Amino acid sequence: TTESLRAATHDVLAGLTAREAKVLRMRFGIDMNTDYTLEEVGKQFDVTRERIRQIEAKALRKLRHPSRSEVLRSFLDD
Amino acid sequence: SVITVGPYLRLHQCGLPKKMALELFKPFIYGKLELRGLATTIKAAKKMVE
Lengths: 78, 50
Known about the structure:
Chain B: Belongs to the RNA polymerase beta' chain family. Chain B: DNA-dependent RNA polymerase catalyzes the transcription of DNA into RNA using the four ribonucleoside triphosphates as substrates. Chain B: The RNAP catalytic core consists of 2 alpha, 1 beta, 1 beta' and 1 omega subunit. When a sigma factor is associated with the core the holoenzyme is formed, which can initiate transcription. Chain B: This is DNA-directed RNA polymerase subunit beta'. Chain A: This is RNA polymerase sigma factor RpoD. The structure is cut from a larger assembly and holds chains A and B. By secondary structure, chain A is an all-alpha fold. Chain A has helices spanning 2-15, 18-28, 38-44, 50-63. Chain A contains 4 helices and no strands. Chain A is globular. Chain B has 3 helices and no strands. In chain B, helix 2 crosses helix 3. Chain B is elongated, with a radius of gyration of 15 Å. Chain B starts with 18 loop residues before the first helix and ends with a helix. The relative contact order of chain B is 0.12. The chains are: A mainly alpha, B mainly alpha. The A-B interface holds A 1, 4, 70-71, 74-75, 77-78 and B 40-44.
């Protein structure tokens, strides 16, 4: 189920916008070693840090839809 | 399990029971069930096989 969840999250990040995928990977430590903080993401990508939170809120609003997470609703019990 | 007398068949088969065939061919009926598309994930296939 972990190996299937990896491919499922890879397909979800590939189905969305590529820059959204890079933010969601380098934010929580997906496909990286360390999880970068908000100041480190601000030093890497762009100075504005409130727009990063707006991007995160927009990504959560796009990922609350059941049609894009119907294969992930079965993984909710784990 | 306990052997049981019955010819019942041709010589190339010998009477394997039902529940042991359900238990021992269980990852096979995950693998040939997830490919054909009667389930979303294998975690749902857990519930669909119990």
